[PDB]
Amino acid sequence: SKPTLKEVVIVSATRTPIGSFLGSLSLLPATKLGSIAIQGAIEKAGIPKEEVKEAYMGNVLQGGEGQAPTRQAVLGAGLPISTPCTTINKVCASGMKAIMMASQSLMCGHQDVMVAGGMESMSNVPYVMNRGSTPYGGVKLEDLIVKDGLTDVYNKIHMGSCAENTAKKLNIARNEQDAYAINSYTRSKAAWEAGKFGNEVIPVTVTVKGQPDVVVKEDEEYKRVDFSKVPKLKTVFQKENGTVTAANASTLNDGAAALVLMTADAAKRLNVTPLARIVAFADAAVEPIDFPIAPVYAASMVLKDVGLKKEDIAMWEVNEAFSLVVLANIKMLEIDPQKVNINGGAVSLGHPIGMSGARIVGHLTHALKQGEYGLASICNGGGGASAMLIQKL
Amino acid sequence: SKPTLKEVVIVSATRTPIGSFLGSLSLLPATKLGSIAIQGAIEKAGIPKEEVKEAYMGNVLQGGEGQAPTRQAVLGAGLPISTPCTTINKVCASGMKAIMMASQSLMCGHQDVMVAGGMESMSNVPYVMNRGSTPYGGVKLEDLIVKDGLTDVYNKIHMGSCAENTAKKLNIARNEQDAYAINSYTRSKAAWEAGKFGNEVIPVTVTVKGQPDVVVKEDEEYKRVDFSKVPKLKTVFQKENGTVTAANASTLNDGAAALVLMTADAAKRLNVTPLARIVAFADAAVEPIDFPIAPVYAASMVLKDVGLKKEDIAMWEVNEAFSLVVLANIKMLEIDPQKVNINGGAVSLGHPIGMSGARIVGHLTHALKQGEYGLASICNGGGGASAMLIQKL
Amino acid sequence: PTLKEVVIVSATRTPIGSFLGSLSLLPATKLGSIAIQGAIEKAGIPKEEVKEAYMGNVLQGGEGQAPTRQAVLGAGLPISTPCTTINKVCASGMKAIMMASQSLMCGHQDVMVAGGMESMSNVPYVMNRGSTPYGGVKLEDLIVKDGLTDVYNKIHMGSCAENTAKKLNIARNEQDAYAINSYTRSKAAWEAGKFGNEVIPVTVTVKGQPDVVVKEDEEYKRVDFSKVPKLKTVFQKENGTVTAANASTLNDGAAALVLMTADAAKRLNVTPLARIVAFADAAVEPIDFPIAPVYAASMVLKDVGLKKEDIAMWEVNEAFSLVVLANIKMLEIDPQKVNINGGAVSLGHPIGMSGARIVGHLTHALKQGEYGLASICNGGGGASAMLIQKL
Amino acid sequence: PTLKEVVIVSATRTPIGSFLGSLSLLPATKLGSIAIQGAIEKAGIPKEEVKEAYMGNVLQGGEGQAPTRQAVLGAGLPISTPCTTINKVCASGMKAIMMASQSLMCGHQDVMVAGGMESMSNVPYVMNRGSTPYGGVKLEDLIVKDGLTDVYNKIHMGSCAENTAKKLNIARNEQDAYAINSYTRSKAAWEAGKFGNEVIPVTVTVKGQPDVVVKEDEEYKRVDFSKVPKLKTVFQKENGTVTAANASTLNDGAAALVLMTADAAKRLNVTPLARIVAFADAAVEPIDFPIAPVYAASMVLKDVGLKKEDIAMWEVNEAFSLVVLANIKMLEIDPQKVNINGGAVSLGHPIGMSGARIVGHLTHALKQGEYGLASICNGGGGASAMLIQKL
Ligand SMILES: CC(C)(COP(=O)(O)OP(=O)(O)OC[C@H]1O[C@@H](n2cnc3c(N)ncnc32)[C@H](O)[C@@H]1OP(=O)(O)O)[C@@H](O)C(=O)NCCC(=O)NCCS
Ligand SMILES: CC(C)(COP(=O)(O)OP(=O)(O)OC[C@H]1O[C@@H](n2cnc3c(N)ncnc32)[C@H](O)[C@@H]1OP(=O)(O)O)[C@@H](O)C(=O)NCCC(=O)NCCS
Ligand SMILES: CC(C)(COP(=O)(O)OP(=O)(O)OC[C@H]1O[C@@H](n2cnc3c(N)ncnc32)[C@H](O)[C@@H]1OP(=O)(O)O)[C@@H](O)C(=O)NCCC(=O)NCCS
Ligand SMILES: CC(C)(COP(=O)(O)OP(=O)(O)OC[C@H]1O[C@@H](n2cnc3c(N)ncnc32)[C@H](O)[C@@H]1OP(=O)(O)O)[C@@H](O)C(=O)NCCC(=O)NCCS
Ligand SMILES: [Cl-]
Ligand SMILES: [Cl-]
Ligand SMILES: [Cl-]
Ligand SMILES: [Cl-]
Ligand SMILES: [K+]
Ligand SMILES: [K+]
Ligand SMILES: [K+]
Ligand SMILES: [K+]
């Protein structure tokens, strides 16, 4: 009737700090950030590097990164030349989809240990020029962040304008979004001060010929705020009756996250103690413009599949693509906002698009208390979302 | 214990013709070719579009294609907005890896029907300019085909130069390579004129305003050859004792392929006759320069895994990245040349890189006789290969 | 010293090539070399006699260092020859001749070459120095940016023409009739062999290809009279007058004159073609450049006490059909004496070359004793004019 | 008519800014307007008296149509003022003065402005028109392609300087000593207030930021004498001599002079600063440009019948320290009379401007009755020189 599958466990979840656009980590390619997160995750797992059998990494903006970004990140982390690698693109959901797909390989018994995560260096995303002849009168070379990353293909508008569309329908006003945003910055600061990212974040040292070293040991974005200015900001994506601003939207960022995943049997063989069990996951899709609400349906799928209720979830991570998205999800699901993005999120910590889906699973892994269920969901351009249920061990 | 998995069958396999670089299909983006193949596959399968639950497309050079290439391809094929999509990058192995990952989802019982394949428009791959301050003395605009597609990161040389290195190691000379190349063109012409791609390839109508419609109904590349010229050509990747020429290497091309995959149970439910069973698959990786021999190890893994012998394979599809690669594989596996790439391959038909791993699997599906085993393998930049074993139903 | 008299000893040019057309493979400086060599040959003097060279050239971006020096050295003139490149927009080729004449008048040199050169086919695009702006980078076309856009008004030259069409009531049908007349006159002149002494052929050499000899202007054949009244108004969509047919085109070409003092011409026993009588620049409100040649022409006439009736042949550069009509309207001159063998609307307009071409054409076409007046407008509101008398 | 006497009535310049430095937000034409307006104000004449303007400007790409016209109209001069932009590479700013003097000598104008302008900070990159080559392309830097690369040898100006250093045995240490000397002289002259009638300040305004007043040259402070002997030889790896310290730098600036006939100065009740006595251009093999100024200077001296000893001060443009040393050696002049208040190695070298700056500096620094001689080399193998006498 129903397939009998291997049990999948998370043994470590590690990330770089998230750097701001053109900021602290901007000199480092996405693949280098990948290598740093992958090397960190293997160290934290306490396993040999040779034990990693295969690697999948989310990475949305691959233009100009060179051949096989995941291979670059893996070989860059000192893993064996024998390690197969695949780079995954589900827009903002990439980092999560990588984990899901790796989980599926493990469930099939096709590998026993894998690394999965995401990486993005938005600072280093290039501009493009069409192949062919230059038209008389000039041409604008397009920005790949905008063209590939942030523009809905079908509506020919920015992700922000799609968010405005949801704001309208669900009556989610500027003040509520601004309040959510301030709250995210508040929670991010609290968490960092309380040392809530001790085992999760590893520092990166930026070495430049001549000048002194810079050690980046925390997320850069959450300190770039002025609470007084927040309600004074102009709406960036919609002038007429807008709600979304630079403050209450996610930002553009650099970072990478990696998880060591293995079967239950593998963890025993290697004598390592798992952090959490990956229970179920799902993808959902809606009209491209309606992506902010796709996480609702994805989350519900996962709950229905396992036969749990929203109340059974101790901790939710709903990616803060826009403050609007989180509020849209809180509204439709009817869940306790005190249980949502408790230690901050993409609005204040930043959103390296290919890594965020991995980061939020990594964070549940650490923050959950033994036995608790954690649910992470993440929307994506095109009308998609991914969700994942884990249980702490 | 080994998991108990669902059985996966191929119900249809369809592709566009392969267009030459800046040739017959150069006006169509990769995603549009994707839509044509996906629509083709579904119609050929004789199922409602709504039965397709999820889609994975291989696509190596995603820059400038717009957000979520697979979503574009899927929605462009008129599939429901409810259909989740993911774009896969394992370089030249992408089209096969997409099928593999879709198979793992089916095996897990996570979906019952999926579309998997590959797409590439090398004609439309753009040039790139780095973000940042313009360096004194000049700004480089790099060709993404060269930078992301064809250049080994680690050795900093063309794929063709890596091939030369294997030609050296295994003493595969210019004459043998040229002979293989002529053989490939010969087989392609024969197969095309015999009507052998009658159920595999669907024609493409190119429409230009004011111009007469062009119907591309067959592969463009195989007619672009002069056998007398073959031995005369210069070895374009190496000065001292070269072997690889434009004639005996694959070309740059445009095309897409798509397969409808389902569980044995779903095929029964939908009352469709499955074409083949997907038995096993594997990824192998070696030293980046040695990618030409990676398919040897991947095929060997698959054979060892299923407990089959090389002699048990009725038809081999070893992707013709370079004539060199096929010869190296024949050499190491000690297989019958007459059973390899029987109706031509990438040297004569062209190599839209994200598509080819899907095409060759689709070709075995149509070409195998009832009960026969077919093995498809494909190398990728970085030092990898994927391989798949199917059995005709 | 007293001021020296200046004579034109030779005047030569390449054919004019269409945009991305027959001469598009040759850089402007190479066209310049061809013209300069040809003029020296026609003058019948040793190259060593040429003391200094000035060339008009408007769009110098990407041509490499010192375009006039490249033209001169490329024509095999002595390394001792000083060179200067001149930019008065479309007036450049005439202003080079004027400034050369002044040097000769001062006794500072006795023999010079002056002319102009342009390869609009090879003018590049530009990217600004600095940081790439988020959201995209603009690559501007230097033809449009440096060549054809008025700085002050932020409009195309073609829109300045429309402005004059309004103020002087010069209609679309009138501009179209002028353009058709220009194409007619160019074809008639070419058929009659009127350019046999003025134009020298250019051989275009490509590796692995057979040589192509370009012996005549390309542009004047690119016309369909039936289509002329049907064309869209490209610079002003609504109630416009200027079109692709009735405007000058973008083109490649070079022209060069050998100039000497009367004393040097005698010393070298060459037969001068014409004497330079007077020249002048005028400038007006930037948008009103179409009428600047009227003032420039008036200045030269007044300078030497001649009346408009004393001019046998007028060359009023055909930047637009509108410009010539405006000049005829304001000066009230006989249209049958204006641009008699065609002009820039039909022959094309390599912008730095045209002001030299039209002086050179008068030098060949005028009959002994006749006066010719050449005038040419330029972006920014300028014009230059020159009066010569055929010897 | 006989040749008219030419006088310099004012000479003014912006400070020179470093590459991407204090004046980098201003286009060349705006620096031009500032210098022109300053020169006219200092002259004390109605601006309407200025009849025509020539400005040197080497790297014109992307500056928009008719750079000199933009500078002149931006300075508030009348729309009736004709304008021409001059390109003789680094000699441009001097050649503009020479050409304007020739017009005045002919009596073709009685008052002109002449000078030079350059914003190397704003010089763009270029992409060729046409289809993009498979495998990509490098967009060239116009400073490098048009400004600093010799066409014929396909090497940097700096490598041409190396050739002369080798031929004349002018060593690394001698070049460094000259460069330190220039920096020392520049600082001392700035500290003594020697530029108070020459340089006018520039206020740089950014909406949202406070005003920055640029009141002195930026470059001469960017030096560390202890480092000078440690620098790499950036144009030549083996046996090199030229470095960043002992070569001129890339810079932004403009200079403008008001020139009149002696009659016009009398008419307008103006007391001129200096008389323009003579000028000349010389040219040699392109690679040998460093020595062209020797020949240009010798021409002027021989023309007027002066000997080197009759010259009170020499301004030999400091394109490289090597150039000045080659000139001092070949001419056998007293080094204490050469570039007395610094030069391009330490003040910087906005290439279209420097030839005018050095003439303006002599006009201010010479004492009554003294002769000053300015000379300047240019890419392609040229030089210009000019002799003035202080009144
Ligand atoms: C919104 C976006 C375009 C940034 O806008 P921006 O205008 O270039 O951002 P800026 O840094 O110029 O900020 C604009 C203003 O907001 C202010 N601001 C920004 N963040 C702030 C904060 N946290 N608190 C207070 N003020 C803030 C700035 O000070 C600035 O004020 P100013 O106009 O007086 O100078 C970009 O971050 C974006 O597109 N984000 C969404 C990313 C996305 O869509 N991801 C995928 C999800 S589907
Ligand atoms: C080989 C490659 C660099 C193109 O080289 P190219 O020299 O620009 O190819 P061209 O079309 O200019 O062909 C060169 C010559 O070969 C000839 N030629 C090419 N294919 C031929 C054939 N099949 N039969 C006869 N002659 C042929 C052409 O006529 C041409 O001759 P010419 O010099 O008289 O014009 C490019 O196609 C490539 O990189 N291929 C490999 C792709 C790859 O690496 N894929 C991934 C695998 S890991
Ligand atoms: C006018 C200009 C913008 C060209 O415009 P364009 O629309 O790209 O010109 P095209 O070549 O595409 O011609 C457009 C149409 O006119 C037609 N056409 C052009 N010249 C024609 C002629 N002489 N007779 C008949 N038809 C003609 C073309 O066939 C084309 O027809 P189509 O739309 O059915 O295909 C350009 O030549 C220009 O800027 N000229 C002015 C140059 C200038 O200002 N110089 C300085 C003077 S101050
Ligand atoms: C020389 C040139 C290429 C600049 O070279 P650069 O290497 O990019 O110059 P930089 O500013 O990076 O200086 C390099 C080094 O020299 C040092 N330096 C430069 N000028 C110095 C000075 N005056 N004193 C001490 N040190 C100095 C810098 O500190 C730097 O040292 P670092 O490597 O420890 O940081 C450029 O200025 C040039 O082309 N000049 C010639 C212009 C020209 O040819 N004009 C026309 C004449 S015909
Ligand atoms: Cl999706
Ligand atoms: Cl791999
Ligand atoms: Cl010169
Ligand atoms: Cl003017
Ligand atoms: K924010
Ligand atoms: K081939
Ligand atoms: K025309
Ligand atoms: K210096």
**Domains, in order of start, for chain D:** 1-125+194-276 (3.40.47.10), 152-193+277-388 (3.40.47.10)
B residues 318-357 closer than 8 Å to C (CB): none
Q: D144 at the B interface (CB within 8 A)?
A: yes
For residue B115, give both structure tokens: 């579309």
Indicate if the alpha-carbon torsion angle D98, D101, D103, D106 is positive or negative.
negative
Q: How far apart are CA C332 and CA C347, in angstroms?
A: 25
* DSSP symbols for D68-130: HHHHHHHTT--TT--EEEEEBTBTHHHHHHHHHHHHHHTTS-SEEEEEEEEEGGG--EEE-SS
Ligand 3 centre to CA of D184 (Å) is: 60
Pick from B5, B144, B382: CB nearest A108: B5
Residues of C in contact with D2 (CB under 8 A): 1-3
Please tell me which residue of chain D has the smallest CA distance to A133. D131
Resolution (A): 1.9
**B276: phi > 0 → left, psi -120 to 50 → alpha, else beta; which?**
beta
CA distances to A283, B128, C134, D130, D388 from B139, rounded to whole Å, are 42, 10, 17, 18, 44
Interface test with A, best of B35, B89, B115 (most A CBs within 10 A): B89
Q: Does A263 touch chain B (CB under 8 A)?
A: no
What residue type is assigned to position B223 of the chain? K
Alpha carbon of C188 to ligand 11 centroid (Å): 17
Q: Find the A163 Cα to ligand 9 centroid distance in Å.
A: 14
Closest residue, chain D, to B134 (C-alpha): D125
Among candidate residues D116, D121, D114, the one with its CA nearest the CA of residue D204: D121
Residues of C within 8 A of A141 (CB-CB) are 136-139
CA–CA dist B99, B113 (Å, integer): 12
- Determine contact, residues A240/A163, Cβ cutoff 8 Å: no
Cβ–Cβ contact D131 with B under 8 A: no
Calpha distance B86→C384 (Å, rounded): 66
Q: How many CA atoms lie within 13 A of D20 on its CB side?
A: 9
Query: Closest Cα to residue C286, out of D65, D37, D54?
Result: D65
DSSP three-state, residue A57 = strand
Give the tokens for residue C12: 């030569």
> For residue B216, what is the enclosing H or E element?
strand B214-216
Of D92, D73, D366, nearest to D253 (Cα)? D92
SS3 content of chain D, % helix, strand, coil (to 5): 40, 25, 35
**Alpha-helical regions (H) of chain C:** 28-43, 67-74, 92-105, 142, 157-167, 172-191, 262-267, 292-304, 321-331, 344-347, 354-365
Give the residue whose CA is nearest to atom 16 of ligand 4.
D244
**Are the Cβ atoms of C63 and D122 closer than 8 angstroms?**
no
State the alpha helices, DSSP H only, in chain D: 28-43, 67-74, 92-105, 142, 157-168, 172-191, 262-267, 292-304, 321-331, 344-347, 351-365
Tell me how far apart the alpha carbons of residues A123 and A380 are, in angstroms, rounded to a whole number: 20
Q: What's the B252 CA to ligand 2 centre distance in angstroms? A: 9
Nearest to D99 by CA among D279, D304, D314: D279
Judge whether A187 is annotated as a binding position: no
- Using the Cβ of C109 and the Cβ atoms of chain D, whether some distance falls under 8 Å is answered with no
Q: Cα distance from A233 to chain C (closest Cα, Å)?
A: 20
**Please, which residues have CB less than 5 A from ligand 8, an ion?**
C 283, 380, 382; D 82-83
Whether D387 has its CB under 8 Å from any CB of chain C: the answer is no
The dihedral sign for the CA sequence C298, C299, C301, C302: positive
> What residues does B285 pair with on adjacent strands?
B384
Q: Which residue puts its alpha carbon closest to atom 40 of ligand 1?
A: A251
Virtual torsion, Cα A212, A42, B297, A102, nearest 10 deg: -110
Nearest residue by C-alpha to atom 7 in ligand 3: C244
For chain C, which chains pass the contact test of at least 3 CB pairs under 8 Å? A, B, D
Helices (H) and strands (E) in chain D, counts: 11, 16
- Measuring from atom 8 of ligand 2, which residue has the nearest CA? B246
Partner-chain contact A84 B284, CB within 8 Å: yes
Q: Is the CB of A252 under 6 A from ligand 1?
A: yes
Enumerate residues 6+ apart whose C-beta is below 8 A from B322: B159, B160, B163, B177, B244, B248, B249, B250, B292, B347
Tell me the chain B residues in contact with residue C137 when contact means C-beta distances shorter than 8 Å: 129
CA distance B268 to chain C (A): 51
Phi, psi (rounded to 5 degrees) for B390:
-125, 155
d(CA A363, CA A317) in angstroms, rounded, equals 8
Q: Which atom of ligand 2 is nearest to the CA of B291?
A: 48
* Distance separating alpha carbons of residues A60 and A252, to the nearest angstrom: 13
Query: Does residue B45 contact residue B260 with C-beta atoms inside 8 Å?
Result: yes
Contact B247, B178 (CB under 8 A): yes
Nearest to C283 by CA among C296, C300, C298: C296
Ligand 1 lined by A233 (C-beta under 6 Å): yes
**Dihedral sign (CA C294, C299, C300, C302):** positive
Give the burial string for C165-187 (b: 16+ CB within 10 Å, else e): beeeebebebbbbbbbbbbebbe
In which element (H, E) is residue D25 found?
none
User: Ligand 1 centre and the CA of D281: distance in Å?
Assistant: 58
Tokens, residue D115: 């000078």
Distance CA B364, CA B217 (A): 20
Can you read off the two tokens belonging to residue D375? 């000379």
Distances (CA, A) of C141 to A114, B166, C120, D158, D284: 52, 47, 11, 31, 36
Q: Which residues, 6+ apart, have CB-to-CB distance to A228 below 8 Å?
A: none
Nearest CA-CA partner of D124 in D140, D103, D113:
D140
CB atoms within 10 A of CB A38: 31
Q: Which residues pair with C252 in a beta bridge?
A: C17, C119
Q: How many residues does chain B have?
A: 393
Residue B321 known to bind ligand:
no
What is the CA(C238)–ligand 10 centre distance, in A?
54
- Is D90 marked active-site? yes
The residue whose CA has the least distance to atom 33 of ligand 4 is: D231
Q: Whose CA is nearest to atom 35 of ligand 2?
A: B233
Q: How far apart are CA B351 and CA B378, in angstroms?
A: 11
Residues of C in contact with A140 (CB under 8 A): 136-139
What tokens were used for A129? Answer: 């020029």
What residues of chain D lie within 8 A of the CB of A134, using their CB?
127, 129-132
Question: Residues D339, D341, D344, D350: is their CA dihedral positive or negative?
Answer: negative
Chain D, nearest residue to A138 by Cα: D129
- Measuring from each residue's beta carbon to the nearest atom of ligand 4, which residues come in under 6 Å? D 90, 148, 157-158, 223-224, 227-228, 231, 234, 244-245, 247-250, 319, 349, 351, 379
Give residue B60's region: left, alpha or beta (phi > 0; psi -120 to 50): alpha
